[PDB]
């Protein structure tokens, strides 16, 4: 037998580290090796994705220097503490970011040193706010062929995530290989702080500043009136016998919101006298 | 041995290799450069490879060597004249060249 | 040391001041224009020169209090009709 | 609708040419400079046009 | 006859010489609500025909 | 969340713009386009696109991955040196020429007349030529007319060497000819000479080379 | 010093060559038209201070 | 040196993490751990830091240790596996520094001849921007004492990357963009008219300071100065500004004009689709 309904639980240092880690290396794929702790069956942590030194003959197992694990890892015992690695990470930035033969070839090495040994997969050339490129698995085994296979006791926590089917070619590959939840989770001491970094290091930065403006009176007249004669075409055209006519189009954007935003935003800073000036 | 400014001595023989606009676009560098070290000698041994005469379209791979020459004879005239770019030419027979040139 | 600049000042001010006479406060203040410690334009169609921004002295306590009046007088002026100003504005925000 | 353009943001497709249909449902695709391909049909086209 | 924006002035000197000719704003506008009126107009028996 | 949609549209074209060239259209919201990377791709357009400069063929952006359309460009891609934009004429005078009234004055009825007096043939019907061959003996001037009428020319100029186009990328030559004739519909009545012409105008081929 | 040299050469590895493009014209002022010797166009732009 | 800085907010998660790593066990007093940076121009960046254990007892605030060792070999480790990195300073947590902090930066100012300190507070509601940047250097003293060793208020920022906020504007989904035109121009209002001149307030309160105390250092060198600075506007009661009226009128001139012009163009938008589609619904409706 009986499994439940797994869930990948994220400290985002892990995130910010691939992002790093793999905008740094962005030409080549890396290999590395994450660290969190093993909390239960049905979630697991990431805490801590941590450097691992580059290969240059082949990404593969051998990129695990053991004596940097000795080393690496006992230098974070005698950091704040010594937590449980959960697992790897590595890269695919050339393409859109599969189960390379090398992770089939270090994936049983991984679960003969772990119990889960989920992959982290990415491709660092996506997004710059949106996609969740990170790429999470379980190589279930053959030996289980005779039973049926992916259990995961209810499947409505799995049936919701069934929701994308995602990356045919790992559909491809959806022998013994199965996406698993990963929520963004929440930092209390840090999602509010950091909100206060980007929301108020971001709002004039200093809060203070701006409250450029005589030039985007002529750019901004341009930009109006420009599009405003071929706004103003079609009402040559409007008519009656509406299905034996057939050109319905807006011609109404950018000049309320874009003019409202420009001449009431400058006609504050035309208050920006009055106001910052007694 | 008197000058010895910059004498690009063209043997004009290893220009083609295999390719389409390959030479063409030797050509194109050679006038460009040419164009750039303001006191450039131009020198070519044995046109009689290159040059011709004229063919009523024989072998397929005159006609490359014909546009390879007619980028000489418009990048040699163009609209745009050369400065101090002097073309010293050399050959066996003369008789054989093009009018053209 | 007087209220703001006056924004006009006279040959009778810098002559007094300076002990001298009228027809030296051009090579006064082109000669200030010299050292660099004021910008300011020769107002001189009525002999009364214009001020611009000038090196100061050393602050003094009653300049510090006298400093804190005007000063805290811009301070609480800006600051309240800056809150007079958000409570018209304090309608609008939804 | 607007939440409906990860549709537009789907992975784009080949335009082929099609010499002739073999059988058991499959086809013959030249791309636009490749080889010869046999491949495979889908259920909502029509072997009936090929 | 001829102008080059000297304007006449019996006491200045200078006989003054000046002009803004960038004003395209209300140039531009202008012209634009002249073509609006008559595309109104071009309304206006739509207007007045699907009613009554 | 209409506006989050409206930045999830906006961020399609930042980093990249991949450059090919619009084919075919089929119909609404699916298109073929020939990238500049040699290969044709069914594609789909965006609503963004208005539908109108879809034309025939247009320089237009892609996507890297899923590869669709992004955009539809502005004339551009060089006709070479471009039209030669400035001043750069040969500098001959019209007199220049010494004694060809023939010449000068049936190349003036060709094409300097057209640039002038063209509604004048519209009422008429004399159906004015496209273009004009120049031949003959070679060294009389063949260039020079060319010179002056050059020197001596409002609209664009467009000068062809007619060797240009046989080169390296296998299929630049007739986007280059779309070039120079997007262009040349683009500018003005405007006047391109092609000098050369023989280096692509050859009657015997063969298809196997 | 030969692990200077060494180091210095070590301190070298890390570094990834770059493209050889051509500008084929400037479009706007952040969108630049280039042509790649290898094939096709692309349009990008300048990093800050270029 | 120093231009200013170019910080990610990644690294000041790698103090907030190690504030988790104390936060669990006894604080003495703060953290100090490394700050390494990406020193290139004048201006400074950080990608990546790490922290290395420390305590301090007060009582000649001289008792205080970190591990060089461990430093080189985990700075060994960084410097293996990424070449850009070196160290360029240190950090600690806790918002106020002491006496001490001249002895952490002039003990690890050996390294490299620059170690910039950062300020941040784990439980920020008042300052702006968290981060701070100061340099230890002399300007002797007008008095000139025995090296009145300093550190100076290098100016700081938030540095920014492409593809760094790929998580964090997704995890914090709470942003509305591009609010102008509606209350971001009057939330600027509010905490810059009410938090900036109450910084004004303290330092008028800091002028009360040398009322009754502030001989240390009265500081008549920049005060008086650079508040001369400000004294480019001596704006007293008549309030002298007769040469800015018209200069009010000109700056109101255009503006109205493209609300008069634009805005009833504004009218001239709604009014034909509103009034067509209007009555096609109306009258269409049966
Ligand atoms: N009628 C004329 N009056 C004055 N100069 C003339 C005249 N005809 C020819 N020329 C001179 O001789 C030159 C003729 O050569 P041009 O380059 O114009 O033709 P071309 O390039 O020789 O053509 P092609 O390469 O086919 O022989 C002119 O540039 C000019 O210097
Ligand atoms: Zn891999």
Redesign the pocket.
């Known amino acids: 037998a009986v499994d439940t309904a797994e869930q990948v639980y994220i400290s985002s240092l892990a995130l910010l580290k691939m992002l790093k880690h793999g905008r740094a290396g962005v030409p080549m794929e890396v290999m590395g090796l994450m660290l969190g702790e093993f909390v239960d069956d049905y979630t697991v942590r990431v805490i801590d994705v941590f450097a691992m030194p580059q290969s240059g003959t082949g990404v593969s197992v051998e990129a695990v220097d053991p004596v940097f694990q000795a080393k690496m890892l006992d230098m974070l015992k005698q950091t704040g503490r010594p937590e449980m690695v959960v697992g790897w990470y590595h890269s695919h930035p050339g393409f859109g970011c599969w189960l390379s033969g090398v992770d089939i070839n270090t994936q049983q090495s991984f679960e003969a040193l772990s119990e889960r040994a989920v992959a982290v997969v990415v491709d660092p050339i996506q997004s710059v706010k949106g996609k969740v490129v990170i790429d999470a698995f379980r190589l279930i085994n053959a030996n289980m062929m005779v039973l049926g296979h992916e259990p995961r006791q209810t499947t409505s926590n799995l049936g919701h995530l069934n929701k994308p089917s995602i990356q045919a070619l790992i559909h491809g590959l959806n022998r013994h290989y199965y996406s698993i939840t990963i929520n963004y989770r929440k930092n209390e001491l840090e999602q509010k702080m950091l909100l206060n970094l980007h929301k108020k290091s971001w709002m004039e930065g200093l809060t203070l500043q701006d409250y450029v403006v005589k030039e985007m009176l002529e750019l901004a007249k341009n930009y109006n009136k420009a599009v405003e004669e071929e706004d103003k075409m079609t009402p040559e055209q409007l008519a009656i016998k509406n299905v034996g006519k057939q050109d319905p189009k807006r011609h109404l954007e950018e000049h309320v919101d874009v003019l409202m935003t420009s001449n009431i935003v400058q006609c504050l800073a035309a208050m920006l006298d009055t106001v910052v000036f007694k | 041995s008197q000058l010895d400014c910059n004498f690009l001595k063209v043997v004009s023989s290893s220009i083609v290799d295999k390719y389409i606009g390959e030479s063409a676009r030797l050509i194109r560098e050679m006038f460009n450069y040419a164009r750039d070290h303001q006191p450039c000698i131009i020198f070519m041994d044995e046109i009689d490879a290159i040059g011709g005469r004229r063919f009523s379209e024989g072998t397929s791979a005159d006609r490359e060597i014909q546009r390879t020459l007619m980028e000489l004879?418009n990048q040699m005239?163009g609209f745009d004249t050369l400065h101090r770019v002097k073309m010293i030419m050399a050959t066996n027979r003369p008789d054989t060249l093009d009018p053209?040139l | 040391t007087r209220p703001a600049n006056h924004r006009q000042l006279t040959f009778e001010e810098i002559a007094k001041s300076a002990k001298i006479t009228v027809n030296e406060v051009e090579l006064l203040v082109m000669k200030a224009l010299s050292v660099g410690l004021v910008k300011g334009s020769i107002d001189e169609v009525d002999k009364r020169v214009h001020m611009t921004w000038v090196q100061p002295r050393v602050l003094d306590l009653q300049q510090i209090k006298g400093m804190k009046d005007r000063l805290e007088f811009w301070c609480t002026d800006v600051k309240s009709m800056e809150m007079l100003v958000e409570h018209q504005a304090h309608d609008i925000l939804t | 609708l607007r939440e409906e353009l990860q549709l537009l943001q789907e992975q784009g497709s080949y335009v082929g040419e099609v010499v002739r249909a073999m059988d058991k449902k499959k086809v013959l695709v030249k791309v636009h400079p490749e080889g010869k391909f046999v491949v495979d049909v889908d259920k909502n086209i029509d072997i009936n046009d090929v | 006859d001829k102008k080059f924006h000297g304007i006449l002035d019996q006491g200045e000197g200078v006989l003054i010489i000046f002009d803004e000719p960038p004003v395209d704003k209300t140039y531009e506008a202008a012209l634009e609500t002249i073509q609006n009126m008559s595309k109104v107009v071009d309304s206006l028996y739509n207007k007045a025909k699907k009613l009554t | 969340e209409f506006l989050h949609a409206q930045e999830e549209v906006k961020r399609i074209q930042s980093i990249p713009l991949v450059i090919g060239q619009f084919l075919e259209a089929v119909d609404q919201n699916t298109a073929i386009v020939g990238s500049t990377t040699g290969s044709n791709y069914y594609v789909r357009i965006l609503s963004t696109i208005d539908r109108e400069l879809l034309k025939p063929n247009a320089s237009v952006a892609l996507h890297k991955h899923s590869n669709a359309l992004v955009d539809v460009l502005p004339p551009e891609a060089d006709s070479s040196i471009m039209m030669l934009t400035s001043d750069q004429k040969p500098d001959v005078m019209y007199a220049?020429?010494?004694?060809?009234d023939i010449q000068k004055q049936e190349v003036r009825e060709a094409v300097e007349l057209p640039l002038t007096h063209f509604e004048l043939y519209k009422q008429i019907g004399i159906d004015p030529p496209r273009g004009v061959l120049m031949y003959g003996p070679?060294?009389?001037?063949?260039?020079?007319l060319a010179?002056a009428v050059a020197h001596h020319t409002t609209a664009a100029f467009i000068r062809v060497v007619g060797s240009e186009f046989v080169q390296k990328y296998l299929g630049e030559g007739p986007r280059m000819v779309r070039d120079v004739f997007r262009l040349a519909k683009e500018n003005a009545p405007a006047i391109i000479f092609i000098d050369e012409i023989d280096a692509i105008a050859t009657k015997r081929f063969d298809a196997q080379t | 010093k030969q692990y200077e040299k060494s180091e210095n050469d070590l301190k070298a590895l890390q570094s990834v060559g770059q493209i050889v493009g051509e500008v084929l014209k400037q479009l706007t002022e952040e969108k630049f038209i280039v042509k790649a010797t290898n094939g096709p166009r692309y349009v990008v732009g300048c990093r800050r201070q270029l | 040196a120093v231009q200013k800085v170019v910080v990610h907010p990644l690294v000041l998660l790698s103090v907030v993490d190690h504030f988790n790593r104390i936060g669990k066990v006894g604080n003495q007093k703060r953290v100090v751990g490394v700050l390494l940076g990406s020193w290139q121009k004048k201006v400074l960046d950080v990608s990546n830091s790490f922290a290395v254990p420390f305590d301090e007892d007060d009582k000649d605030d001289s008792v205080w240790f970190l591990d060089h060792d461990y430093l080189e070999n985990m700075y060994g480790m960084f410097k293996k596996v990424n070449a850009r990195e070196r160290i360029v300073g240190w950090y600690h947590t806790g918002p106020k520094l002491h006496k001490n902090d001249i002895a952490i930066n002039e003990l690890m100012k050996r390294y490299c001849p620059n170690s910039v300190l950062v300020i941040i507070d784990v439980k920020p509601k008042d300052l702006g921007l968290p981060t701070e940047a100061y340099i230890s250097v002399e300007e002797v003293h007008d008095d000139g004492t025995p090296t009145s060793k300093t550190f100076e208020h290098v100016t700081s920022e938030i540095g920014a990357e492409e593809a760094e906020e790929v998580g964090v504007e997704h995890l914090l989904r709470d942003i509305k963009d591009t609010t102008v035109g509606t209350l971001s121009q009057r939330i600027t209002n509010q905490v810059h008219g009410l938090k900036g001149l109450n910084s004004k307030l303290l330092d008028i309160r800091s002028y009360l300071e040398k009322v009754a105390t502030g001989k240390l250092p009265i500081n008549h060198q920049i005060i008086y100065q650079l508040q001369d600075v400000f004294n480019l506007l001596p704006d007293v009661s008549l309030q002298e500004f007769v040469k800015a009226f018209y200069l009010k009128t000109n700056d109101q001139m255009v503006v109205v004009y493209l609300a008069s012009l634009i805005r009833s163009v504004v009218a001239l938008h709604n009014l034909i689709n509103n009034k067509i589609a209007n009555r096609d619904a109306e009258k269409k409706e049966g």
């Open positions: 004879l005239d053209a | 220049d020429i010494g004694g060809m070679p060294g009389c001037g063949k260039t020079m010179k």
